[PDB]
PDB file of all heavy atoms in Angstrom:
ATOM      1  N   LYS Y   1       0.818  -1.208   0.000  1.00 42.58           N
ATOM      2  CA  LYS Y   1       0.000   0.000   0.000  1.00 42.58           C
ATOM      3  C   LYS Y   1       0.853   1.259   0.000  1.00 42.58           C
ATOM      4  O   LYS Y   1       0.440   2.287  -0.548  1.00 42.58           O
ATOM      5  CB  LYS Y   1      -0.940  -0.007   1.204  1.00 42.58           C
ATOM      6  CG  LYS Y   1      -1.934  -1.156   1.204  1.00 42.58           C
ATOM      7  CD  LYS Y   1      -2.728  -1.197  -0.092  1.00 42.58           C
ATOM      8  CE  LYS Y   1      -3.712  -0.038  -0.186  1.00 42.58           C
ATOM      9  NZ  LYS Y   1      -4.149   0.213  -1.589  1.00 42.58           N
ATOM     10  N   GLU Y   2       2.038   1.201   0.602  1.00 42.49           N
ATOM     11  CA  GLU Y   2       2.976   2.303   0.458  1.00 42.49           C
ATOM     12  C   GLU Y   2       3.580   2.319  -0.937  1.00 42.49           C
ATOM     13  O   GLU Y   2       3.691   3.381  -1.558  1.00 42.49           O
ATOM     14  CB  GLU Y   2       4.068   2.195   1.515  1.00 42.49           C
ATOM     15  CG  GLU Y   2       3.530   2.149   2.925  1.00 42.49           C
ATOM     16  CD  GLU Y   2       4.579   1.729   3.924  1.00 42.49           C
ATOM     17  OE1 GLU Y   2       5.694   1.370   3.492  1.00 42.49           O
ATOM     18  OE2 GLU Y   2       4.292   1.756   5.139  1.00 42.49           O
ATOM     19  N   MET Y   3       3.950   1.147  -1.454  1.00 41.70           N
ATOM     20  CA  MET Y   3       4.614   1.084  -2.746  1.00 41.70           C
ATOM     21  C   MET Y   3       3.658   1.309  -3.907  1.00 41.70           C
ATOM     22  O   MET Y   3       4.104   1.688  -4.994  1.00 41.70           O
ATOM     23  CB  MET Y   3       5.324  -0.259  -2.899  1.00 41.70           C
ATOM     24  CG  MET Y   3       6.615  -0.338  -2.109  1.00 41.70           C
ATOM     25  SD  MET Y   3       7.418  -1.949  -2.169  1.00 41.70           S
ATOM     26  CE  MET Y   3       6.018  -3.044  -1.985  1.00 41.70           C
ATOM     27  N   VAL Y   4       2.356   1.099  -3.709  1.00 43.90           N
ATOM     28  CA  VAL Y   4       1.406   1.413  -4.770  1.00 43.90           C
ATOM     29  C   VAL Y   4       1.172   2.917  -4.870  1.00 43.90           C
ATOM     30  O   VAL Y   4       0.683   3.399  -5.899  1.00 43.90           O
ATOM     31  CB  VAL Y   4       0.093   0.636  -4.558  1.00 43.90           C
ATOM     32  CG1 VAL Y   4      -0.780   1.294  -3.502  1.00 43.90           C
ATOM     33  CG2 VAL Y   4      -0.665   0.442  -5.870  1.00 43.90           C
ATOM     34  N   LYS Y   5       1.548   3.683  -3.845  1.00 42.47           N
ATOM     35  CA  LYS Y   5       1.396   5.131  -3.858  1.00 42.47           C
ATOM     36  C   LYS Y   5       2.670   5.840  -4.293  1.00 42.47           C
ATOM     37  O   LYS Y   5       2.933   6.967  -3.861  1.00 42.47           O
ATOM     38  CB  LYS Y   5       0.941   5.626  -2.487  1.00 42.47           C
ATOM     39  CG  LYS Y   5      -0.433   5.116  -2.054  1.00 42.47           C
ATOM     40  CD  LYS Y   5      -1.565   5.768  -2.842  1.00 42.47           C
ATOM     41  CE  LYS Y   5      -2.227   4.802  -3.823  1.00 42.47           C
ATOM     42  NZ  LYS Y   5      -3.319   5.447  -4.595  1.00 42.47           N
ATOM     43  N   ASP Y   6       3.468   5.199  -5.134  1.00 43.30           N
ATOM     44  CA  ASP Y   6       4.626   5.842  -5.729  1.00 43.30           C
ATOM     45  C   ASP Y   6       4.235   6.378  -7.105  1.00 43.30           C
ATOM     46  O   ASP Y   6       3.073   6.302  -7.515  1.00 43.30           O
ATOM     47  CB  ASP Y   6       5.797   4.868  -5.790  1.00 43.30           C
ATOM     48  CG  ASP Y   6       6.011   4.135  -4.484  1.00 43.30           C
ATOM     49  OD1 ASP Y   6       5.485   4.598  -3.453  1.00 43.30           O
ATOM     50  OD2 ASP Y   6       6.700   3.094  -4.490  1.00 43.30           O
ATOM     51  N   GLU Y   7       5.196   6.936  -7.837  1.00 39.27           N
ATOM     52  CA  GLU Y   7       4.859   7.634  -9.070  1.00 39.27           C
ATOM     53  C   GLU Y   7       5.506   7.009 -10.298  1.00 39.27           C
ATOM     54  O   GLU Y   7       4.829   6.734 -11.293  1.00 39.27           O
ATOM     55  CB  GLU Y   7       5.266   9.105  -8.962  1.00 39.27           C
ATOM     56  CG  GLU Y   7       4.172  10.020  -8.436  1.00 39.27           C
ATOM     57  CD  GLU Y   7       3.753   9.678  -7.018  1.00 39.27           C
ATOM     58  OE1 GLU Y   7       4.637   9.370  -6.191  1.00 39.27           O
ATOM     59  OE2 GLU Y   7       2.537   9.708  -6.732  1.00 39.27           O
ATOM     60  N   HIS Y   8       6.815   6.776 -10.238  1.00 40.86           N
ATOM     61  CA  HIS Y   8       7.583   6.355 -11.401  1.00 40.86           C
ATOM     62  C   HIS Y   8       7.939   4.875 -11.347  1.00 40.86           C
ATOM     63  O   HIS Y   8       9.014   4.475 -11.799  1.00 40.86           O
ATOM     64  CB  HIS Y   8       8.845   7.203 -11.528  1.00 40.86           C
ATOM     65  CG  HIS Y   8       8.579   8.676 -11.549  1.00 40.86           C
ATOM     66  ND1 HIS Y   8       7.921   9.299 -12.587  1.00 40.86           N
ATOM     67  CD2 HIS Y   8       8.878   9.649 -10.656  1.00 40.86           C
ATOM     68  CE1 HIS Y   8       7.830  10.593 -12.334  1.00 40.86           C
ATOM     69  NE2 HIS Y   8       8.402  10.830 -11.169  1.00 40.86           N
ATOM     70  N   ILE Y   9       7.039   4.053 -10.799  1.00 41.90           N
ATOM     71  CA  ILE Y   9       7.293   2.623 -10.687  1.00 41.90           C
ATOM     72  C   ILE Y   9       7.312   1.931 -12.035  1.00 41.90           C
ATOM     73  O   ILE Y   9       7.893   0.849 -12.158  1.00 41.90           O
ATOM     74  CB  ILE Y   9       6.262   1.957  -9.761  1.00 41.90           C
ATOM     75  CG1 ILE Y   9       4.841   2.306 -10.202  1.00 41.90           C
ATOM     76  CG2 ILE Y   9       6.517   2.338  -8.332  1.00 41.90           C
ATOM     77  CD1 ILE Y   9       3.775   1.540  -9.459  1.00 41.90           C
ATOM     78  N   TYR Y  10       6.681   2.517 -13.050  1.00 43.95           N
ATOM     79  CA  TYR Y  10       6.866   2.022 -14.406  1.00 43.95           C
ATOM     80  C   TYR Y  10       8.305   2.221 -14.855  1.00 43.95           C
ATOM     81  O   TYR Y  10       8.875   1.364 -15.538  1.00 43.95           O
ATOM     82  CB  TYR Y  10       5.892   2.721 -15.349  1.00 43.95           C
ATOM     83  CG  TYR Y  10       6.310   2.731 -16.798  1.00 43.95           C
ATOM     84  CD1 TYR Y  10       6.297   1.563 -17.554  1.00 43.95           C
ATOM     85  CD2 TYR Y  10       6.694   3.912 -17.419  1.00 43.95           C
ATOM     86  CE1 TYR Y  10       6.671   1.572 -18.883  1.00 43.95           C
ATOM     87  CE2 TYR Y  10       7.068   3.931 -18.747  1.00 43.95           C
ATOM     88  CZ  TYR Y  10       7.054   2.759 -19.474  1.00 43.95           C
ATOM     89  OH  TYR Y  10       7.423   2.774 -20.798  1.00 43.95           O
ATOM     90  N   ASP Y  11       8.916   3.333 -14.460  1.00 41.20           N
ATOM     91  CA  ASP Y  11      10.323   3.546 -14.750  1.00 41.20           C
ATOM     92  C   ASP Y  11      11.238   3.004 -13.664  1.00 41.20           C
ATOM     93  O   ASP Y  11      12.424   2.785 -13.927  1.00 41.20           O
ATOM     94  CB  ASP Y  11      10.610   5.032 -14.953  1.00 41.20           C
ATOM     95  CG  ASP Y  11      11.820   5.268 -15.829  1.00 41.20           C
ATOM     96  OD1 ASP Y  11      11.665   5.266 -17.067  1.00 41.20           O
ATOM     97  OD2 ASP Y  11      12.930   5.437 -15.283  1.00 41.20           O
ATOM     98  N   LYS Y  12      10.727   2.804 -12.451  1.00 38.56           N
ATOM     99  CA  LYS Y  12      11.553   2.209 -11.407  1.00 38.56           C
ATOM    100  C   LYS Y  12      11.767   0.724 -11.664  1.00 38.56           C
ATOM    101  O   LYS Y  12      12.855   0.195 -11.411  1.00 38.56           O
ATOM    102  CB  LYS Y  12      10.907   2.426 -10.041  1.00 38.56           C
ATOM    103  CG  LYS Y  12      11.777   2.097  -8.840  1.00 38.56           C
ATOM    104  CD  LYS Y  12      11.321   2.920  -7.644  1.00 38.56           C
ATOM    105  CE  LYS Y  12      12.300   2.860  -6.486  1.00 38.56           C
ATOM    106  NZ  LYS Y  12      12.329   1.526  -5.838  1.00 38.56           N
ATOM    107  N   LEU Y  13      10.740   0.040 -12.173  1.00 39.86           N
ATOM    108  CA  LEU Y  13      10.835  -1.401 -12.366  1.00 39.86           C
ATOM    109  C   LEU Y  13      11.746  -1.756 -13.527  1.00 39.86           C
ATOM    110  O   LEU Y  13      12.450  -2.769 -13.468  1.00 39.86           O
ATOM    111  CB  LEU Y  13       9.451  -1.997 -12.594  1.00 39.86           C
ATOM    112  CG  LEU Y  13       8.635  -2.275 -11.336  1.00 39.86           C
ATOM    113  CD1 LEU Y  13       7.276  -2.832 -11.699  1.00 39.86           C
ATOM    114  CD2 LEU Y  13       9.377  -3.227 -10.431  1.00 39.86           C
ATOM    115  N   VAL Y  14      11.757  -0.932 -14.576  1.00 40.55           N
ATOM    116  CA  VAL Y  14      12.491  -1.286 -15.782  1.00 40.55           C
ATOM    117  C   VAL Y  14      13.994  -1.157 -15.551  1.00 40.55           C
ATOM    118  O   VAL Y  14      14.790  -1.867 -16.175  1.00 40.55           O
ATOM    119  CB  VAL Y  14      11.983  -0.431 -16.963  1.00 40.55           C
ATOM    120  CG1 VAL Y  14      12.220   1.039 -16.723  1.00 40.55           C
ATOM    121  CG2 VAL Y  14      12.569  -0.879 -18.297  1.00 40.55           C
ATOM    122  N   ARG Y  15      14.410  -0.314 -14.610  1.00 38.36           N
ATOM    123  CA  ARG Y  15      15.821  -0.262 -14.263  1.00 38.36           C
ATOM    124  C   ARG Y  15      16.237  -1.396 -13.344  1.00 38.36           C
ATOM    125  O   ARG Y  15      17.437  -1.633 -13.180  1.00 38.36           O
ATOM    126  CB  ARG Y  15      16.156   1.078 -13.608  1.00 38.36           C
ATOM    127  CG  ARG Y  15      15.975   1.104 -12.099  1.00 38.36           C
ATOM    128  CD  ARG Y  15      15.768   2.513 -11.600  1.00 38.36           C
ATOM    129  NE  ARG Y  15      14.734   3.208 -12.355  1.00 38.36           N
ATOM    130  CZ  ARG Y  15      14.536   4.517 -12.299  1.00 38.36           C
ATOM    131  NH1 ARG Y  15      15.305   5.268 -11.524  1.00 38.36           N
ATOM    132  NH2 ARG Y  15      13.574   5.076 -13.015  1.00 38.36           N
ATOM    133  N   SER Y  16      15.282  -2.115 -12.764  1.00 39.63           N
ATOM    134  CA  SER Y  16      15.599  -3.086 -11.730  1.00 39.63           C
ATOM    135  C   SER Y  16      15.180  -4.483 -12.151  1.00 39.63           C
ATOM    136  O   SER Y  16      14.550  -5.208 -11.376  1.00 39.63           O
ATOM    137  CB  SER Y  16      14.914  -2.703 -10.423  1.00 39.63           C
ATOM    138  OG  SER Y  16      13.588  -2.280 -10.673  1.00 39.63           O
ATOM    139  N   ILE Y  17      15.512  -4.868 -13.377  1.00 42.00           N
ATOM    140  CA  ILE Y  17      15.130  -6.181 -13.872  1.00 42.00           C
ATOM    141  C   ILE Y  17      16.278  -7.161 -13.702  1.00 42.00           C
ATOM    142  O   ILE Y  17      16.166  -8.142 -12.961  1.00 42.00           O
ATOM    143  CB  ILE Y  17      14.696  -6.109 -15.341  1.00 42.00           C
ATOM    144  CG1 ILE Y  17      13.498  -5.181 -15.468  1.00 42.00           C
ATOM    145  CG2 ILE Y  17      14.361  -7.487 -15.849  1.00 42.00           C
ATOM    146  CD1 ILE Y  17      13.028  -5.009 -16.869  1.00 42.00           C
ATOM    147  N   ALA Y  18      17.395  -6.899 -14.374  1.00 39.93           N
ATOM    148  CA  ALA Y  18      18.458  -7.865 -14.347  1.00 39.93           C
ATOM    149  C   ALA Y  18      19.804  -7.170 -14.224  1.00 39.93           C
ATOM    150  O   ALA Y  18      20.105  -6.277 -15.031  1.00 39.93           O
ATOM    151  CB  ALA Y  18      18.443  -8.742 -15.596  1.00 39.93           C
ATOM    152  N   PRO Y  19      20.621  -7.552 -13.243  1.00 37.38           N
ATOM    153  CA  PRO Y  19      21.977  -6.997 -13.155  1.00 37.38           C
ATOM    154  C   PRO Y  19      22.916  -7.534 -14.216  1.00 37.38           C
ATOM    155  O   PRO Y  19      23.964  -6.922 -14.452  1.00 37.38           O
ATOM    156  CB  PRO Y  19      22.441  -7.414 -11.752  1.00 37.38           C
ATOM    157  CG  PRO Y  19      21.213  -7.936 -11.052  1.00 37.38           C
ATOM    158  CD  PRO Y  19      20.323  -8.455 -12.124  1.00 37.38           C
ATOM    159  N   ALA Y  20      22.578  -8.644 -14.866  1.00 32.51           N
ATOM    160  CA  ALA Y  20      23.442  -9.243 -15.871  1.00 32.51           C
ATOM    161  C   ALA Y  20      23.308  -8.595 -17.243  1.00 32.51           C
ATOM    162  O   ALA Y  20      23.884  -9.106 -18.209  1.00 32.51           O
ATOM    163  CB  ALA Y  20      23.154 -10.741 -15.980  1.00 32.51           C
ATOM    164  N   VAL Y  21      22.573  -7.495 -17.360  1.00 36.10           N
ATOM    165  CA  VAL Y  21      22.367  -6.828 -18.635  1.00 36.10           C
ATOM    166  C   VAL Y  21      22.560  -5.331 -18.426  1.00 36.10           C
ATOM    167  O   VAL Y  21      22.379  -4.809 -17.322  1.00 36.10           O
ATOM    168  CB  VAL Y  21      20.967  -7.166 -19.215  1.00 36.10           C
ATOM    169  CG1 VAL Y  21      19.848  -6.521 -18.403  1.00 36.10           C
ATOM    170  CG2 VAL Y  21      20.863  -6.839 -20.704  1.00 36.10           C
ATOM    171  N   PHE Y  22      22.989  -4.648 -19.482  1.00 36.50           N
ATOM    172  CA  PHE Y  22      23.099  -3.198 -19.495  1.00 36.50           C
ATOM    173  C   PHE Y  22      22.357  -2.641 -20.701  1.00 36.50           C
ATOM    174  O   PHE Y  22      22.481  -3.167 -21.810  1.00 36.50           O
ATOM    175  CB  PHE Y  22      24.558  -2.743 -19.543  1.00 36.50           C
ATOM    176  CG  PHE Y  22      24.719  -1.319 -19.971  1.00 36.50           C
ATOM    177  CD1 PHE Y  22      24.306  -0.290 -19.140  1.00 36.50           C
ATOM    178  CD2 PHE Y  22      25.246  -1.006 -21.215  1.00 36.50           C
ATOM    179  CE1 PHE Y  22      24.429   1.024 -19.533  1.00 36.50           C
ATOM    180  CE2 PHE Y  22      25.368   0.305 -21.615  1.00 36.50           C
ATOM    181  CZ  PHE Y  22      24.963   1.322 -20.771  1.00 36.50           C
ATOM    182  N   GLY Y  23      21.611  -1.558 -20.483  1.00 38.41           N
ATOM    183  CA  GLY Y  23      20.964  -0.879 -21.591  1.00 38.41           C
ATOM    184  C   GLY Y  23      19.799  -1.688 -22.117  1.00 38.41           C
ATOM    185  O   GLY Y  23      19.117  -2.394 -21.364  1.00 38.41           O
ATOM    186  N   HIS Y  24      19.589  -1.593 -23.439  1.00 38.04           N
ATOM    187  CA  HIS Y  24      18.535  -2.303 -24.171  1.00 38.04           C
ATOM    188  C   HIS Y  24      17.154  -2.016 -23.587  1.00 38.04           C
ATOM    189  O   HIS Y  24      16.325  -2.913 -23.443  1.00 38.04           O
ATOM    190  CB  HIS Y  24      18.790  -3.811 -24.220  1.00 38.04           C
ATOM    191  CG  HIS Y  24      20.221  -4.181 -24.444  1.00 38.04           C
ATOM    192  ND1 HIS Y  24      20.887  -5.083 -23.644  1.00 38.04           N
ATOM    193  CD2 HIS Y  24      21.114  -3.772 -25.374  1.00 38.04           C
ATOM    194  CE1 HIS Y  24      22.126  -5.223 -24.078  1.00 38.04           C
ATOM    195  NE2 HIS Y  24      22.292  -4.434 -25.124  1.00 38.04           N
ATOM    196  N   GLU Y  25      16.908  -0.749 -23.250  1.00 38.21           N
ATOM    197  CA  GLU Y  25      15.717  -0.336 -22.514  1.00 38.21           C
ATOM    198  C   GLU Y  25      14.416  -0.558 -23.275  1.00 38.21           C
ATOM    199  O   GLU Y  25      13.346  -0.485 -22.663  1.00 38.21           O
ATOM    200  CB  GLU Y  25      15.842   1.137 -22.133  1.00 38.21           C
ATOM    201  CG  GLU Y  25      15.721   2.094 -23.308  1.00 38.21           C
ATOM    202  CD  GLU Y  25      17.039   2.327 -24.029  1.00 38.21           C
ATOM    203  OE1 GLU Y  25      18.037   1.642 -23.712  1.00 38.21           O
ATOM    204  OE2 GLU Y  25      17.080   3.202 -24.920  1.00 38.21           O
ATOM    205  N   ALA Y  26      14.475  -0.816 -24.580  1.00 36.78           N
ATOM    206  CA  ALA Y  26      13.278  -1.215 -25.306  1.00 36.78           C
ATOM    207  C   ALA Y  26      12.832  -2.614 -24.901  1.00 36.78           C
ATOM    208  O   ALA Y  26      11.675  -2.821 -24.519  1.00 36.78           O
ATOM    209  CB  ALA Y  26      13.532  -1.141 -26.810  1.00 36.78           C
ATOM    210  N   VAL Y  27      13.743  -3.589 -24.964  1.00 38.57           N
ATOM    211  CA  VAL Y  27      13.350  -4.974 -24.729  1.00 38.57           C
ATOM    212  C   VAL Y  27      13.117  -5.235 -23.247  1.00 38.57           C
ATOM    213  O   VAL Y  27      12.371  -6.158 -22.895  1.00 38.57           O
ATOM    214  CB  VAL Y  27      14.400  -5.934 -25.327  1.00 38.57           C
ATOM    215  CG1 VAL Y  27      15.713  -5.890 -24.569  1.00 38.57           C
ATOM    216  CG2 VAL Y  27      13.871  -7.358 -25.455  1.00 38.57           C
ATOM    217  N   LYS Y  28      13.684  -4.407 -22.367  1.00 38.34           N
ATOM    218  CA  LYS Y  28      13.392  -4.540 -20.947  1.00 38.34           C
ATOM    219  C   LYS Y  28      11.942  -4.197 -20.643  1.00 38.34           C
ATOM    220  O   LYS Y  28      11.357  -4.758 -19.711  1.00 38.34           O
ATOM    221  CB  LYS Y  28      14.319  -3.649 -20.126  1.00 38.34           C
ATOM    222  CG  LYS Y  28      15.796  -3.851 -20.384  1.00 38.34           C
ATOM    223  CD  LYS Y  28      16.203  -5.299 -20.227  1.00 38.34           C
ATOM    224  CE  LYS Y  28      16.129  -5.762 -18.779  1.00 38.34           C
ATOM    225  NZ  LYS Y  28      16.816  -4.843 -17.840  1.00 38.34           N
ATOM    226  N   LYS Y  29      11.343  -3.299 -21.426  1.00 40.53           N
ATOM    227  CA  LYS Y  29       9.941  -2.969 -21.221  1.00 40.53           C
ATOM    228  C   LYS Y  29       9.044  -4.134 -21.602  1.00 40.53           C
ATOM    229  O   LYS Y  29       8.049  -4.406 -20.926  1.00 40.53           O
ATOM    230  CB  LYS Y  29       9.575  -1.728 -22.028  1.00 40.53           C
ATOM    231  CG  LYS Y  29      10.185  -0.446 -21.496  1.00 40.53           C
ATOM    232  CD  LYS Y  29       9.623   0.771 -22.211  1.00 40.53           C
ATOM    233  CE  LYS Y  29      10.257   0.956 -23.577  1.00 40.53           C
ATOM    234  NZ  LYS Y  29      11.714   1.226 -23.472  1.00 40.53           N
ATOM    235  N   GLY Y  30       9.400  -4.854 -22.659  1.00 39.43           N
ATOM    236  CA  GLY Y  30       8.551  -5.907 -23.170  1.00 39.43           C
ATOM    237  C   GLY Y  30       8.506  -7.154 -22.314  1.00 39.43           C
ATOM    238  O   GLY Y  30       7.445  -7.765 -22.156  1.00 39.43           O
ATOM    239  N   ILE Y  31       9.656  -7.537 -21.757  1.00 39.80           N
ATOM    240  CA  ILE Y  31       9.725  -8.762 -20.969  1.00 39.80           C
ATOM    241  C   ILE Y  31       8.968  -8.598 -19.655  1.00 39.80           C
ATOM    242  O   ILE Y  31       8.403  -9.566 -19.128  1.00 39.80           O
ATOM    243  CB  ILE Y  31      11.204  -9.156 -20.773  1.00 39.80           C
ATOM    244  CG1 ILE Y  31      11.354 -10.431 -19.937  1.00 39.80           C
ATOM    245  CG2 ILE Y  31      11.994  -8.008 -20.179  1.00 39.80           C
ATOM    246  CD1 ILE Y  31      12.777 -10.893 -19.769  1.00 39.80           C
ATOM    247  N   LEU Y  32       8.884  -7.369 -19.141  1.00 37.75           N
ATOM    248  CA  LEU Y  32       8.117  -7.129 -17.925  1.00 37.75           C
ATOM    249  C   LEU Y  32       6.629  -7.306 -18.174  1.00 37.75           C
ATOM    250  O   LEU Y  32       5.905  -7.805 -17.305  1.00 37.75           O
ATOM    251  CB  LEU Y  32       8.423  -5.733 -17.388  1.00 37.75           C
ATOM    252  CG  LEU Y  32       7.902  -5.340 -16.004  1.00 37.75           C
ATOM    253  CD1 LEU Y  32       8.942  -4.480 -15.332  1.00 37.75           C
ATOM    254  CD2 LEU Y  32       6.597  -4.562 -16.078  1.00 37.75           C
ATOM    255  N   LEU Y  33       6.154  -6.906 -19.351  1.00 35.96           N
ATOM    256  CA  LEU Y  33       4.758  -7.146 -19.683  1.00 35.96           C
ATOM    257  C   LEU Y  33       4.499  -8.623 -19.911  1.00 35.96           C
ATOM    258  O   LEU Y  33       3.406  -9.115 -19.611  1.00 35.96           O
ATOM    259  CB  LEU Y  33       4.349  -6.341 -20.912  1.00 35.96           C
ATOM    260  CG  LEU Y  33       3.841  -4.915 -20.671  1.00 35.96           C
ATOM    261  CD1 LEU Y  33       2.671  -4.952 -19.712  1.00 35.96           C
ATOM    262  CD2 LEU Y  33       4.901  -3.937 -20.187  1.00 35.96           C
TER     263      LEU Y  33
END
């Protein structure tokens, strides 16, 4: 309930997917969906 009241979690999640990868911010959006 605290974390649902954030703002940029669409952009917060895409930076926090995999430490074994850098960049490729297009395909990081797709795999989360």
Side-chain angles (χ1 to χ4, degrees):
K1 298 306 289 161
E2 304 167 354
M3 284 176 318
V4 79
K5 297 288 109 181
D6 313 343
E7 269 63 41
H8 306 293
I9 52 172
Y10 157 71
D11 206 85
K12 191 154 191 290
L13 278 179
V14 62
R15 89 203 50 194
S16 43
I17 300 178
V21 70
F22 162 69
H24 320 129
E25 71 274 7
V27 69
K28 306 306 291 310
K29 289 188 282 296
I31 179 177
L32 189 143
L33 272 304

